[PDB]
Structures are given as C-alpha cells and as structure tokens.
Design an enzyme around this catalytic site. Sequence first.
Site, PDB file in Angstrom:
ATOM      1  N   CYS A 199      22.804 -38.966   5.623  1.00 15.32           N
ATOM      2  CA  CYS A 199      22.282 -37.825   4.867  1.00 15.32           C
ATOM      3  C   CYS A 199      23.236 -36.628   4.930  1.00 15.32           C
ATOM      4  O   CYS A 199      23.604 -36.173   6.012  1.00 15.32           O
ATOM      5  CB  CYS A 199      20.904 -37.424   5.413  1.00 15.32           C
ATOM      6  SG  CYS A 199      20.045 -36.091   4.515  1.00 15.32           S
ATOM      7  N   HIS A 245      14.334 -42.720  -0.234  1.00 16.53           N
ATOM      8  CA  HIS A 245      15.017 -41.768   0.627  1.00 16.53           C
ATOM      9  C   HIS A 245      14.875 -40.387  -0.011  1.00 16.53           C
ATOM     10  O   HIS A 245      14.343 -39.461   0.598  1.00 16.53           O
ATOM     11  CB  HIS A 245      16.493 -42.140   0.743  1.00 16.53           C
ATOM     12  CG  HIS A 245      17.307 -41.181   1.555  1.00 16.53           C
ATOM     13  ND1 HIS A 245      17.523 -41.351   2.907  1.00 16.53           N
ATOM     14  CD2 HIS A 245      18.002 -40.075   1.199  1.00 16.53           C
ATOM     15  CE1 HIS A 245      18.326 -40.396   3.344  1.00 16.53           C
ATOM     16  NE2 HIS A 245      18.632 -39.611   2.328  1.00 16.53           N
ATOM     17  N   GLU A 246      15.333 -40.259  -1.253  1.00 20.92           N
ATOM     18  CA  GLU A 246      15.256 -38.985  -1.945  1.00 20.92           C
ATOM     19  C   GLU A 246      13.834 -38.469  -2.067  1.00 20.92           C
ATOM     20  O   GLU A 246      13.582 -37.284  -1.872  1.00 20.92           O
ATOM     21  CB  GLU A 246      15.885 -39.086  -3.337  1.00 20.92           C
ATOM     22  CG  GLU A 246      17.379 -39.393  -3.324  1.00 20.92           C
ATOM     23  CD  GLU A 246      18.153 -38.525  -2.340  1.00 20.92           C
ATOM     24  OE1 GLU A 246      18.008 -37.282  -2.389  1.00 20.92           O
ATOM     25  OE2 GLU A 246      18.915 -39.094  -1.527  1.00 20.92           O
TER      26      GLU A 246
HETATM   27 NI    NI Z   1      19.272 -37.354   2.870  1.00 20.53          NI
END
Ligand code: NI
Length: 183
Positions: free
Chosen positions: A111, A154-155
């Site tokens: 990330c 994830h987003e």
């Molecule tokens: Ni991320």
Amino acid sequence: MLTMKDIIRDGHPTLRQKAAELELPLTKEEKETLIAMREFLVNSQDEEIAKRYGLRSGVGLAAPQINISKRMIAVLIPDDGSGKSYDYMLVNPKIVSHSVQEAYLPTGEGCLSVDDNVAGLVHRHNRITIKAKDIEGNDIQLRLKGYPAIVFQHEIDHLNGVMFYDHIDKNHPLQPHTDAVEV
Ligand code: NI
C-alpha cells in the site's frame, strides 16, 4: 498533477474514517479529483515519469489516500498479456454479492500509504460483483475473479477505513487458509 506529496501515510486519521457517499451528479472539482486519481496510476506505471517523481508502481488508489473522505476509487490493471485489462473510475462502489471461496496473493499485499513492508497473506473473496456509478452518474456492474477481485476489495476497504494488514492472521501469517486459491 498528484504526486507522492499528496499521499497521506499510515497513522493519518482520514485512512481510518468511513468515506462519505457521493451525491450525483459530482461537482466539477470531484470529477477533476477522480480523473487525477486515475492519472496518478498512469504516471506511476510509466517508468520515466514514475522514476522522476519517485512514484511507486500501483494499480489502485482510493480517495481517502489523498485525504478526501469520499467513496471514489480508481483501478488500473494493465494487460498482463492475456488481453484482460481493467481501467475504471468508480463512484459509490459497492460489493453486492461475493464467493464463499477465498483467494490471496502469494507475495502478500502492499500500500502506497504504508511505507514499510508487512508480512502475512491477505485472504479476500475469490469472486465479487460490484455495482457502482461511473464519473457521469451512469450504472456500471462488474463481475471479477482472482487478482482483479483482490485489487477492488483492497481499494473498497479504504472507503471503510480498513487497511490490508488488518486481515493478516496474527498466527501463521505466511500460512494459506484451508484452501483459498493463490493469485
Ligand atoms: Ni492501499
């Protein structure tokens, strides 16, 4: 243009809040923001430009990462050669149905907001269906499996103040669940 200077890092309160839904239609500024979020992904994949600004290559960015607590995300997965590509800017994205089976990346997850690397595998749904609106308020529905499904979850997690490392089992980080697929 958005540069690494606009990316807030882990510890900032905004990454843990719950992003606000967007009212359609988007304001002029909100469209510009979303468009710039995508342009950031493009720049980060361009070796030249990426190297100049020190941008880390990435395929997804949520608005909360540039300190905008709004439910917009940009995803840009390049053609891995198999023809399948993903170029989307989503407003109010929402997972409406998903698999029971799990999936995960071998190498774990990263990330842009997290500078130091983390260990464990992140186990997400292997398949998902997302309903969202495009930049102009029209309806978009996606069915995704594997990696692309992983990127979107994830987003989407960011919009709910959830970081990837929140999923890693404090137990055997490197140990795959009783059969979730790999990749
Ligand atoms: Ni991320």
